[PDB]
Amino acid sequence: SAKDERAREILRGFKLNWMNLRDAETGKILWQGTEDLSVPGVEHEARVPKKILKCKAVSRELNFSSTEQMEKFRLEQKVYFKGQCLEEWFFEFGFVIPNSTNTWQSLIEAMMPASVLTGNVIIETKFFDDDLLVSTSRVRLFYV
Numbered sequence: 070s071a072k073d074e075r076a077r078e079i080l081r082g083f084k085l086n087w088m089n090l091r092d093a094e095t096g097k098i099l100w101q102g103t104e105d106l107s108v109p110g111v112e113h114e115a116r117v118p119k120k121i122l123k124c125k126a127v128s129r130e131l132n133f134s135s136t137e138q139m140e141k142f143r144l145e146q147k148v149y150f151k152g153q154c155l156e157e158w159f160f161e162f163g164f165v166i167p168n169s170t171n172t173w174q175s176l177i178e179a180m181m182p183a184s185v186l187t188g189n190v191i192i193e194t195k196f197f198d199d200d201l202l203v204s205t206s207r208v209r210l211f212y213v
């Protein structure tokens with residue numbers, strides 16, 4: 070379909086350049102990386118400090134480039150524990166200029182112990198342009 074081809078073109082043109090997470094109350098960095106955790110088809114891994122689970126809110130900054138124009142770039146993220154969805158989050162960026170690089174700041178508002186969670190949490194992220202699914206990716210989390 071034209072839509073399927075279009076999703077593939079958007080994916081081809083997309084890269085997540087860097088990302089970080091902060092305690093929203095203190096602004097201290099909890100995590101930073103330059104690995105593109107959005108790449109589909111491989112299980113990514115990340116290690117986060119266990120204090121993140123006690124945060125009332127986390128601020129995320131995600132820097133991305135896109136060759137393609139998007140009308141309504143958005144994300145759906147599911148938190149899976151042993152295969153069970155515990156939480157679903159929605160984030161909207163909106164319009165994306167073709168051949169742009171953009172920083173996207175979002176707030177994530179709030180648990181089992183870190184020792185139970187560690188290695189058993191998968192974040193499933195779906196990237197959309199409006200209702201067109203561009204890609205699905207997965208990251209397994211370890212709490213350190």
Ligand SMILES: O=S(=O)(NCc1ccccc1)c1ccc(S(=O)(=O)N(Cc2ccc(Cl)cc2)C2CCCC2)cc1
Nearest residue numbers: 100106107115117121122129146148155156192194208
């Ligand atoms: O572990 S958490 O502190 N809380 C999730 C949770 C766990 C158990 C029960 C409920 C909620 C957490 C999980 C995921 C995120 S996240 O911002 O979606 N994020 C995953 C992520 C972010 C962006 C993209 Cl494109 C793909 C995946 C990670 C955290 C490690 C590297 C960046 C931020 C915090």
